[PDB]
Amino acid sequence: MQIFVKTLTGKTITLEVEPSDTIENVKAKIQDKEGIPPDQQRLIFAGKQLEDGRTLSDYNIQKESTLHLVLRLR
Amino acid sequence: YLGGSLSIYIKTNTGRTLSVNLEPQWDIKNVKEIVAPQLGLQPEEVKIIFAGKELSDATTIQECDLGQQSILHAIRSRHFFVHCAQCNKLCKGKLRVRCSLCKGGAFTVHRDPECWDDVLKPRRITGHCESQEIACFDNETGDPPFTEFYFKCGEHVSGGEKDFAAPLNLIKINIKDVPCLACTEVSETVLVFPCESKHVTCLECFEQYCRSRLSERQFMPHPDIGYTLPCPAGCENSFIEEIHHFKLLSREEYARYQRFATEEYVLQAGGVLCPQPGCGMGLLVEPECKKVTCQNGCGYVFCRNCLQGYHLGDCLP
Amino acid sequence: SMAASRRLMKELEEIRKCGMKNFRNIQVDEANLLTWQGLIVPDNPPYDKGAFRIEINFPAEYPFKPPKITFKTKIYHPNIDEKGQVKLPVISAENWKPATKTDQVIQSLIALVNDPQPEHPLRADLAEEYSKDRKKFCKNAEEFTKKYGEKRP
Ligand SMILES: [Zn+2]
Ligand SMILES: [Zn+2]
Ligand SMILES: [Zn+2]
Ligand SMILES: [Zn+2]
Ligand SMILES: [Zn+2]
Ligand SMILES: [Zn+2]
């Protein structure tokens, strides 16, 4: 199944990922397709930050849910 | 009553998959006496599993709450509500189960909970699995994984292996003809609010209330829960703890909920938005750092204390 | 705009059949359902048997958002603005339950009129006046309310 990651700009990116995948995996895919540093990425869905350790299935992400991207300079 | 005839897939312990279509009123014992000569096993040997329960030999096929192109399994041994991506309107959901270790189905569940029960937690019950010659073991792991449930839309054709939907646990059939608070209009399908008083609202009012509290960024913020809504009456500790209910509203009305939630999260957590038009990029800069870049974006540098171009001198106006 | 306007209409109907003496002359312009006109006759002496004309506009989100009330007839009263706007605690968005019926709110407004509250004034001068001196306040009040407002038998 597929999901959408969306920078506030409007730049929508389509990523194939399965429910039982950690946030770390998604981060790795996003950064692989764009070039972001792994640490700089903070995924936010419905106003809550997604913990690297947990999975998408723990947050009940549907087909084509929008996981907005926020970038942490740090 | 369109067709009546049902078509069903059957996945055995072995890799083979068998497509068989039946009439909804055949005995499950008969189905066993049909599957047995299908693979060559004896009729006395076959145990059939579906959604976790050891199927009664006498029960009717139609009784099983079964849709189309669904899957049952076999072995030689001897009123829900969900939101669908394809179906915008919420549909009656069906409950299936999958093994945590091998990510497969066809296992027996120990408790079989009816309704209004403790559920939706990663760790609950362990069960025996058929796949991989009964090799689903937790004895070695120590860290305990468990049989986990999932829901499917029952109004249309489904893909048995991985199809799922969002469960809306706050939506019930009006079994006691309870009137909606907002309209005093008894609706067959309603939503129950998490407060003590058990306030209830129909779907029209869910939508109107949401889309009214939405344009002005009025969603109450809880860290763990998310950006949710308070009770219509404003009852304490009555925040919708599963957000997906908002999907009752369509693309615009809900995606904008997502966007606004993200923006407000960025704003309150200390992060700053992007001033360059049509960027809105939220960049969580380390509190002390005061040079703002736009990571993988418009690279415009602003003071953050002025929302203007990068200036060395302090911004007085 | 469905379970909203229809509820509003139902409330309107019940208010119509409930021809309570204090609130009379209901005028709902058939064009816009969201605006009402009314005429209120207080029993108390400061506004004695003088009908005051009010207008009630309901939001497009009526069931979940408090309606607003303005006074087309000028009135000398502390909790009432010069423009005609009114500060009613039952209305104010800080504490307004959706289930609250229109007639209850109207009754609350009437109660507010009969006995003014100087605790939270929109018009400070009148509040200090009424708090400190009542008789001169009552003189100005009765004078003004006989000067403006159409009497009704
Ligand atoms: Zn569906
Ligand atoms: Zn298994
Ligand atoms: Zn309703
Ligand atoms: Zn409540
Ligand atoms: Zn930018
Ligand atoms: Zn500056």
Side-chain angles (χ1 to χ4, degrees):
Chain A
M1 56 95 64
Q2 64 158 354
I3 68 168
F4 296 157
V5 287
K6 180 193 182 63
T7 65
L8 292 314
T9 57
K11 301 296 184 300
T12 304
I13 317 100
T14 71
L15 268 74
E16 190 277 335
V17 60
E18 291 194 344
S20 291
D21 287 340
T22 69
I23 297 297
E24 186 175 354
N25 296 8
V26 181
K27 296 173 72 172
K29 296 304 178 182
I30 301 170
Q31 70 157 325
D32 282 355
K33 283 187 64 178
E34 186 65 19
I36 332 280
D39 301 333
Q40 287 190 357
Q41 287 178 171
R42 308 305 171 190
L43 279 309
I44 283 87
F45 165 84
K48 60 187 176 180
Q49 184 177 169
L50 283 312
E51 297 180 348
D52 295 340
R54 296 178 180 176
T55 74
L56 307 185
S57 180
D58 293 339
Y59 298 90
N60 301 9
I61 294 182
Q62 293 298 298
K63 300 179 183 179
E64 290 110 342
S65 292
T66 61
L67 288 72
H68 286 103
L69 183 55
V70 170
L71 300 171
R72 184 100 182 83
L73 282 73
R74 181 172 180 175
Chain B
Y1 282 98
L2 186 145
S5 308
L6 306 178
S7 182
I8 293 94
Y9 288 82
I10 305 292
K11 295 220 169 191
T12 180
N13 312 120
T14 329
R16 87 156 50 185
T17 90
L18 173 65
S19 174
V20 172
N21 42 13
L22 311 176
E23 187 175 358
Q25 66 180 23
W26 296 8
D27 298 10
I28 291 297
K29 190 177 70 175
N30 298 7
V31 177
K32 290 180 176 183
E33 297 176 355
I34 288 176
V35 172
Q38 260 282 0
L39 187 47
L41 278 57
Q42 292 77 0
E44 312 165 359
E45 303 285 353
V46 281
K47 142 189 174 177
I48 304 191
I49 202 74
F50 174 86
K53 58 190 176 188
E54 183 184 11
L55 292 192
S56 312
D57 297 16
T59 190
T60 305
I61 298 180
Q62 181 186 350
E63 182 71 16
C64 310
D65 295 337
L66 181 130
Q68 296 230 12
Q69 292 187 345
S70 204
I71 303 183
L72 285 72
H73 312 261
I75 188 188
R76 44 183 299 173
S77 63
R78 169 173 290 270
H79 44 283
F80 284 107
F81 282 101
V82 294
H83 184 281
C84 184
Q86 304 178 1
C87 318
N88 296 10
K89 177 183 180 180
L90 52 93
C91 319
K92 300 180 180 180
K94 310 179 297 178
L95 178 139
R96 306 296 174 270
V97 287
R98 280 193 307 262
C99 196
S100 54
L101 183 54
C102 64
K103 302 179 182 60
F107 63 80
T108 312
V109 189
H110 280 69
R111 77 164 69 184
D112 196 24
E114 296 184 345
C115 182
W116 205 82
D117 285 344
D118 315 336
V119 72
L120 306 169
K121 187 175 179 180
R123 295 187 178 177
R124 198 56 69 178
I125 337 160
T126 304
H128 302 83
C129 189
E130 291 180 353
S131 176
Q132 191 57 21
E133 297 181 351
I134 320 184
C136 290
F137 296 105
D138 181 32
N139 187 14
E140 166 57 37
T141 312
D143 300 336
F146 295 87
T147 74
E148 185 144 24
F149 301 69
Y150 67 101
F151 303 86
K152 296 178 61 179
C153 180
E155 199 185 331
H156 62 102
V157 182
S158 308
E161 177 68 11
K162 293 178 184 178
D163 181 21
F164 63 95
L168 282 70
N169 197 27
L170 292 179
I171 295 186
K172 298 179 176 180
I173 183 75
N174 204 1
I175 198 176
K176 293 180 178 178
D177 296 348
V178 191
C180 167
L181 195 164
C183 51
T184 323
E185 186 178 9
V186 45
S187 300
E188 298 175 343
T189 58
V190 289
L191 188 149
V192 171
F193 275 93
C195 64
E196 294 187 12
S197 303
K198 200 183 176 181
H199 297 138
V200 294
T201 59
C202 62
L203 276 64
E204 298 183 9
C205 300
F206 182 86
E207 298 172 25
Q208 184 176 178
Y209 168 69
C210 286
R211 74 173 60 192
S212 61
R213 297 295 183 87
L214 163 55
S215 294
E216 299 146 308
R217 302 175 175 180
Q218 286 179 318
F219 294 105
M220 303 291 181
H222 184 296
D224 301 350
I225 301 305
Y227 273 91
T228 171
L229 280 168
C231 194
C235 296
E236 301 175 348
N237 296 8
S238 56
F239 295 105
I240 306 177
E241 47 192 19
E242 182 164 12
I243 59 104
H244 290 81
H245 297 81
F246 297 121
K247 295 178 73 66
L248 178 55
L249 290 174
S250 290
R251 287 183 174 179
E252 189 184 345
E253 310 267 348
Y254 168 80
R256 75 166 75 169
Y257 158 88
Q258 288 293 336
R259 288 182 179 85
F260 293 161
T262 294
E263 274 192 331
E264 288 302 322
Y265 169 80
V266 178
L267 279 173
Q268 292 285 40
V272 189
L273 277 56
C274 196
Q276 288 294 95
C279 192
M281 188 79 69
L283 291 203
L284 306 176
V285 171
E286 191 69 20
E288 287 82 335
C289 297
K290 293 183 178 178
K291 57 158 196 181
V292 190
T293 53
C294 184
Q295 299 292 326
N296 299 93
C298 62
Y300 192 105
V301 186
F302 63 93
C303 175
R304 184 179 64 192
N305 296 6
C306 65
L307 200 67
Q308 297 286 358
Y310 195 22
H311 58 69
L312 268 175
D314 56 340
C315 45
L316 181 57
Chain C
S1 300
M2 302 181 180
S5 301
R6 290 174 182 180
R7 180 196 191 258
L8 187 149
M9 180 180 180
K10 181 186 183 63
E11 303 290 351
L12 170 58
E13 185 176 0
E14 184 181 1
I15 294 171
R16 284 181 182 179
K17 68 176 181 180
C18 291
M20 295 296 298
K21 56 178 180 299
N22 207 307
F23 183 79
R24 304 164 68 176
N25 200 334
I26 306 177
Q27 183 174 359
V28 180
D29 40 9
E30 306 174 358
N32 294 333
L33 184 62
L34 296 182
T35 52
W36 294 356
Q37 293 188 7
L39 204 32
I40 303 186
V41 279
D43 305 345
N44 292 30
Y47 311 90
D48 216 347
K49 295 184 177 61
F52 284 94
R53 183 179 300 170
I54 82 177
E55 185 183 27
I56 315 173
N57 62 335
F58 305 89
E61 323 151 338
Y62 165 62
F64 303 98
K65 187 181 180 183
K68 290 172 71 175
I69 302 182
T70 322
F71 295 159
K72 294 305 179 179
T73 308
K74 309 175 182 179
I75 176 176
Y76 190 88
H77 190 270
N79 308 140
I80 299 169
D81 194 25
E82 299 180 346
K83 183 171 288 186
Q85 297 176 337
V86 56
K87 188 203 194 71
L88 179 63
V90 177
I91 287 188
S92 186
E94 298 175 347
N95 46 4
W96 182 85
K97 323 298 177 183
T100 309
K101 295 185 175 302
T102 304
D103 51 13
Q104 300 180 353
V105 177
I106 295 182
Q107 182 67 19
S108 177
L109 176 59
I110 290 162
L112 179 61
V113 172
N114 281 340
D115 298 325
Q117 298 175 337
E119 300 294 330
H120 300 89
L122 298 186
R123 213 169 174 183
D125 182 25
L126 286 68
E128 289 285 67
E129 179 167 335
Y130 173 73
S131 283
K132 307 163 185 205
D133 194 355
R134 178 167 296 186
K135 284 305 182 300
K136 292 180 65 177
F137 177 90
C138 290
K139 180 158 68 66
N140 290 29
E142 184 177 359
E143 172 185 1
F144 181 87
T145 57
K146 286 186 176 179
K147 193 180 172 186
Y148 301 96
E150 300 177 342
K151 303 293 183 178
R152 297 177 73 199

